[PDB]
Amino acid sequence: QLHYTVQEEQEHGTFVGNIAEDLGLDITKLSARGFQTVPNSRTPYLDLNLETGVLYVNEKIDREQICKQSPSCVLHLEVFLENPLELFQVEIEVLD
Amino acid sequence: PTVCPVPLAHTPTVTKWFKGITLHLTAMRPTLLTTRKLGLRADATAEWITGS
Amino acid sequence: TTHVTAVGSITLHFSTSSPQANFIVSLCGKKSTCNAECKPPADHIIGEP
Amino acid sequence: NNSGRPLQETAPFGCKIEVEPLRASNCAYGHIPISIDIPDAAFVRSSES
C-alpha cells in the first residue's frame, strides 16, 4: 500500500515521507475533510502533522526494543478521512 | 468513533406476474430482508435467511 | 409550447388512465376533439408512479 | 433484547425518519390548495400572438 524506510539513530523529527503528496489528495482542502490517525494504530515513535502532511520522528529509534517483539523489524500506521470515507495503510522499516 | 468496512451480498433476480413478484436469493451466511407497503397500511416483515 | 409557421403539423405525447381517449385539446386558444380506443398494457411491474 | 424494529421500517405513506431535530421527510398524502398572484408585466395582449 505504501512503503518508507527509516534509518537507525534518529533525533526527534528529521523526515520520513510526504503522504498527501504521494496519494494525490491535495493540500489546503484536507484540513476540513477530517484528517486523522486511527486509534488502532500509532506506534509511539512517529507523529503526524495534520496541516502539511509530513511524518515526524518522535523519540529516538532503538532497534533492540523495537523488533524484540516482531522479528521482521517493521512498523504499522493508518489514516482516514471523511466526506466521503477512506482508509489507507503505511509501513515503515528500520535499517542498519 | 471511527470507520469500519462491511460486506455486500449477491444481487437477486426477480420474476413478474399479475400483482406480485418473486425473489430468487442466495446467502451463505445469515442475512436480513425487510419490506413495507407505501399506502395507509404498512404490513411490515422481517426475516433472517440462510441458503438459496 | 411549440414553434409555429404557415402550414405544418406537430406530434405530442401523452399519458392516460381510461380505456378510451375522449378529451379536448387547445392550441393558441382554439379547441378540437379527439376519440379512439385504447388497449390494455403489456408489462406487469414498472418503476414509476 | 426485545426492542423490535425501528420506526425507519414501519412508517406508513413511505416516509424518511431523521433526527437532530426530529422530523419526517418526504411523505405523500392528501391535497393542498394554493392561491397565487401573478405580476402584470408577464401578460402579453392579444394583438401579438
Side-chain angles (χ1 to χ4, degrees), chain A residues 38-39 80 85-86, chain B residues 1-5:
Chain A
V38 189
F80 80 110
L85 323 181
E86 311 296 6
Chain B
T2 184
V3 296
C4 290

Side-chain angles (χ1 to χ4, degrees), chain D residues 24-44:
Chain D
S25 178
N26 291 117
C27 303
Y29 67 112
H31 305 262
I32 286 182
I34 288 187
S35 156
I36 172 176
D37 188 338
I38 300 168
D40 59 16
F43 288 75
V44 170

Side-chain angles (χ1 to χ4, degrees), chain B residues 32 34 36-42 44 46, chain D residues 5 7-16:
Chain B
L32 196 50
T34 293
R36 60 155 157 163
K37 210 172 280 189
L38 297 195
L40 193 140
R41 291 155 49 93
Chain D
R5 297 307 298 175
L7 214 59
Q8 281 89 5
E9 294 147 3
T10 319
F13 292 78
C15 300
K16 209 167 179 299

